[PDB]
Amino acid sequence: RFLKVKNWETDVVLTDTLHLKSTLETGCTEHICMGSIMLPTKDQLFPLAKEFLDQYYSSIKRFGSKAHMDRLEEVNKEIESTSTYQLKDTELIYGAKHAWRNASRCVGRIQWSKLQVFDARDCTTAHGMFNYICNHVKYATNKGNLRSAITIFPQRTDGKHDFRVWNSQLIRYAGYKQPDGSTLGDPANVQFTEICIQQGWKAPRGRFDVLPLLLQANGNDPELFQIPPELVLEVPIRHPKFDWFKDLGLKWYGLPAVSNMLLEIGGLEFSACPFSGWYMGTEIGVRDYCDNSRYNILEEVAKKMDLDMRKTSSLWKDQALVEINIAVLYSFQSDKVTIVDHHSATESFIKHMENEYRCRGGCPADWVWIVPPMSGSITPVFHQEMLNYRLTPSFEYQPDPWNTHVW
Amino acid sequence: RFLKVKNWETDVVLTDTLHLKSTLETGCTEHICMGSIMLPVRTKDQLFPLAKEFLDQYYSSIKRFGSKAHMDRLEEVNKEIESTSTYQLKDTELIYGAKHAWRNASRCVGRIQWSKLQVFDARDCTTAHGMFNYICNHVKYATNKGNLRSAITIFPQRTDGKHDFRVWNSQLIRYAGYKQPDGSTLGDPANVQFTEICIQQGWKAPRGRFDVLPLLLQANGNDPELFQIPPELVLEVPIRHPKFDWFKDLGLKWYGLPAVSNMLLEIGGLEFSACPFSGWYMGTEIGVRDYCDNSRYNILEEVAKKMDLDMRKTSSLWKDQALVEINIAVLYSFQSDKVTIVDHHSATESFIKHMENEYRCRGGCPADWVWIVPPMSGSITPVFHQEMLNYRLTPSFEYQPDPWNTHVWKG
Ligand code: HEM
Numbered sequence: 059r060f061l062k063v064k065n066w067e068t069d070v071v072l073t074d075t076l077h078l079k080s081t082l083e084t085g086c087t088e089h090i091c092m093g094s095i096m097l098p099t100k101d102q103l104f105p106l107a108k109e110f111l112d113q114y115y116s117s118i119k120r121f122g123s124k125a126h127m128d129r130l131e132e133v134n135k136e137i138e139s140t141s142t143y144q145l146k147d148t149e150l151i152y153g154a155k156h157a158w159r160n161a162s163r164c165v166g167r168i169q170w171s172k173l174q175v176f177d178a179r180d181c182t183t184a185h186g187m188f189n190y191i192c193n194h195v196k197y198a199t200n201k202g203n204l205r206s207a208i209t210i211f212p213q214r215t216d217g218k219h220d221f222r223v224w225n226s227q228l229i230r231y232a233g234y235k236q237p238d239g240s241t242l243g244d245p246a247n248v249q250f251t252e253i254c255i256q257q258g259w260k261a262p263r264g265r266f267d268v269l270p271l272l273l274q275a276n277g278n279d280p281e282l283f284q285i286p287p288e289l290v291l292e293v294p295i296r297h298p299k300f301d302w303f304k305d306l307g308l309k310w311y312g313l314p315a316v317s318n319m320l321l322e323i324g325g326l327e328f329s330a331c332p333f334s335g336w337y338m339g340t341e342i343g344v345r346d347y348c349d350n351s352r353y354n355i356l357e358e359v360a361k362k363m364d365l366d367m368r369k370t371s372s373l374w375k376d377q378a379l380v381e382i383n384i385a386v387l388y389s390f391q392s393d394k395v396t397i398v399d400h401h402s403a404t405e406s407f408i409k410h411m412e413n414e415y416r417c418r419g420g421c422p423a424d425w426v427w428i429v430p431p432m433s434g435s436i437t438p439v440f441h442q443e444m445l446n447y448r449l450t451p452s453f454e455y456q457p458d459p460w461n462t463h464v465w
Numbered sequence: 466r467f468l469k470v471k472n473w474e475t476d477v478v479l480t481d482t483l484h485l486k487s488t489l490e491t492g493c494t495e496h497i498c499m500g501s502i503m504l505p506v507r508t509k510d511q512l513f514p515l516a517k518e519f520l521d522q523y524y525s526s527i528k529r530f531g532s533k534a535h536m537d538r539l540e541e542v543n544k545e546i547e548s549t550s551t552y553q554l555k556d557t558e559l560i561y562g563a564k565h566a567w568r569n570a571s572r573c574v575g576r577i578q579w580s581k582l583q584v585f586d587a588r589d590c591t592t593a594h595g596m597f598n599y600i601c602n603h604v605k606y607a608t609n610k611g612n613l614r615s616a617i618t619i620f621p622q623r624t625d626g627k628h629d630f631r632v633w634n635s636q637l638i639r640y641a642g643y644k645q646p647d648g649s650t651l652g653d654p655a656n657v658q659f660t661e662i663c664i665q666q667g668w669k670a671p672r673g674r675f676d677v678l679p680l681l682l683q684a685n686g687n688d689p690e691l692f693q694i695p696p697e698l699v700l701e702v703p704i705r706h707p708k709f710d711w712f713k714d715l716g717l718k719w720y721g722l723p724a725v726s727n728m729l730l731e732i733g734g735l736e737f738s739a740c741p742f743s744g745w746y747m748g749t750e751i752g753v754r755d756y757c758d759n760s761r762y763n764i765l766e767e768v769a770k771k772m773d774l775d776m777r778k779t780s781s782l783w784k785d786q787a788l789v790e791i792n793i794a795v796l797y798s799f800q801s802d803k804v805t806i807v808d809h810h811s812a813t814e815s816f817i818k819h820m821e822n823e824y825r826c827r828g829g830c831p832a833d834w835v836w837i838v839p840p841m842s843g844s845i846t847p848v849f850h851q852e853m854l855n856y857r858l859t860p861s862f863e864y865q866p867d868p869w870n871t872h873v874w875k876g
Pocket residue numbers: 158161163164165166167169173206207208316319333334335336337338341398403427453
């Protein structure tokens with residue numbers, strides 16, 4: 059019932075008691091571990107509302123107070139009467155911050171208490187959604203001095219009036235299947251790009267075309283909007299030592315803004331809740347650029363470095379990987395756009411884990427996601443045992459809206 | 466029940482049915498995943514089902530399930546258990562058991578090779594001197610002048626738990642570690658505790674950076690005895706770099722034969738507490754972990770200093786740059802000396818091919834992602850993108866406590 063986690067580099071041992079508060083299921087059983095799998099009514103709602111309100115009133119040191127009991131009765135009366143309830147602004151902000159705090163896949167959680175919460179629960183149309191999103195992009199970007207933010211659209215009601223951002227992130231690049239057989243742009247975004255074109259987007263058919271927003275308000279058919287170009291901060295990628303790197307024609311955007319997840323607070327479901335922080339360098343340099351199914355640039359870079367690509371044991375892929383990641387970090391830093399390297403971020407996470415174990419009794423963490431995708435063992439998280447479990451409030455995956463929407 | 470795993474790079478989906486034959490527990494529950502935790506005398510009653518399960522597996526593998534030979538063997542083992550409290554495996558069953566323990570080892574990336582394993586049966590061994598001779602023969606066979614051959618040596622099984630055979634070394638060949646009065650370490654810090662034990666037992670330590678440890682061998686529950694492996698049998702490789710001529714003056718070398726000697730082999734409920742096994746290295750084991758872990762030889766700074774990298778801020782990725790060069794040097798050095806080694810790209814590519822084959826022919830391949838993904842360049846290897854299912858099949862290799870923690874000293 060009490061669990062220990064050890065760091066095998068420092069011998070530091072921490073005791074986890076927070077897992078006992080966990081409610082949701084992991085997908086593992088005593089017989090099988092699914093740790094590497096990517097995607098493993100009124101009666102329902104009151105216990106969830108109560109669980110949340112209890113944690114909230116405990117957090118402001120007013121547990122069992124008159125104000126606690128009164129809010130519990132108020133919400134109970136509201137669920138019994140309306141089949142749902144509304145969060146106070148204080149509860150919404152607490153809930154959003156804790157959904158981030160609880161995000162076991164996120165290495166950036168030392169930042170969790172510093173989150174700007176934009177309450178968009180008064181939004182009614184897709185044009186309104188576009189306005190809120192531009193404002194979030196502008197605030198979060200802050201001319202390169204990035205600030206963490208979330209924008210929260212109205213909660214699910216009966217499930218036929220869902221707010222959704224159809225985009226997987228606020229800013230991403232289009233992908234196009236060519237007659238050639240190859241893919242132009244970002245292959246990750248081929249299906250969604252097709253949906254936009256189908257809905258009438260005039261695609262430029264280039265390598266780095268910022269996708270338009272496809273926004274769905276109140277369960278209505280989604281609508282297209284272009285983010286003002288002047289609000290999308292991009293960074294041309296160059297190398298501090300290699301003059302030729304700039305001629306690859308690479309760029310990336312500064313603001314990573316996940317827009318397809320569902321925020322659950324006190325049993326309420328916020329299906330449109332785009333949130334943004336800043337990039338860890340490996341996200342762009344390792345995954346976005348070097349995944350075989352992404353921009354897949356290792357070959358081109360290695361050829362420009364004149365490495366021996368005849369044999370895997372020359373480690374040519376590894377050498378070009380490091381250089382690409384050096385160029386990503388250098389380019390963002392030179393343009394004064396916030397970015398964190400994987401050494402700095404993982405060091406910060408270990409400190410955050412220690413803080414959470416000390417002050418909260420634990421920190422749910424998914425090692426498979428937390429360890430960076432290059433140089434794993436030279437970062438301290440590789441040597442850190444972690445326990446993964448699901449706490450609420452939470453960010454959850456949800457099915458893509460085009461599979462589910464009724465046109 | 467069927468379980469699917471997807472490869473997110475190729476979209477290949479595989480279906481696992483083998484997990485149904487799993488009996489042992491993982492450490493995980495419906496409420497918690499323990500997938501990153503390093504470490505999460507039998508009765509007659511518990512023994513016969515284990516033996517039966519194993520013999521059924523063995524006779525099925527040889528296409529003799531339900532034959533008179535199968536039935537007679539079950540009867541013979543049942544009689545032997547009821548009579549003597551235990552039983553003896555036939556040579557064929559021992560070979561099959563050892564190969565399958567390897568096949569089932571979810572943390573092993575090298576399993577494409579599982580059916581090619583030389584099994585040395587040492588169950589007639591009675592003394593530590595006998596163990597030493599067996600171990601020297603294993604080392605010489607496995608080394609094969611650099612053309613490494615996988616092998617296992619299997620000493621007598623556990624009886625009452627008071628007469629265990631144990632190799633006290635964690636690997637047959639490893640370097641000594643010495644804690645200095647000023648708090649620094651000479652040699653390999655991983656082996657400081659064991660080095661102190663050896664010195665206590667009478668070893669005269671050279672006190673250098675790469676001293677091959679003596680073997681410390683326990684036969685039949687007796688106190689362990691020290692033996693020096695003949696130096697001519699210990700193949701080592703001086704580490705140099707193909708471009709950087711200063712690399713050799715770091716004074717680095719490593720041994721060619723990785724030979725894990727502290728695990729327990731379980732076959733049909735029998736426990737083989739001394740079962741050293743060896744293959745060949747994947748380069749990252751040495752170049753990433755052994756050389757660059759902060760708690761091991763910790764060479765990153767010295768290498769980066771010699772490369773004249775910008776070390777003022779982590780975001781120059783100086784550690785990452787030095788790491789790749791060290792790993793190039795290790796692969797270069799072994800290949801140049803004609804000592805078998807595999808790079809992490811080749812090894813992971815082969816593992817994926819093995820895994821897909823296992824799914825098709827066996828219905829699954831238990832695999833621990835946390836261990837299978839290499840400790841550098843994770844996502845440019847195919848295993849990073851491969852969903853895996855981790856579960857425990859028997860026969861198996863298991864951890865056991867260090868023998869100095871449990872040994873009853875006779876004097
Ligand atoms: C402040 C800077 C932040 C950094 C450096 C950071 C870092 C990261 C990284 C590197 C990942 C893995 C992403 C991937 O591999 O695709 C991640 C995942 C995640 N982060 Fe953060 N994060 C930050 C802010 C935030 C914020 C503000 C939130 C929510 C308010 C958040 C919630 C999450 C969630 C829910 C995931 C899992 C996403 C998924 O499963 O695809 N993070 N974080």
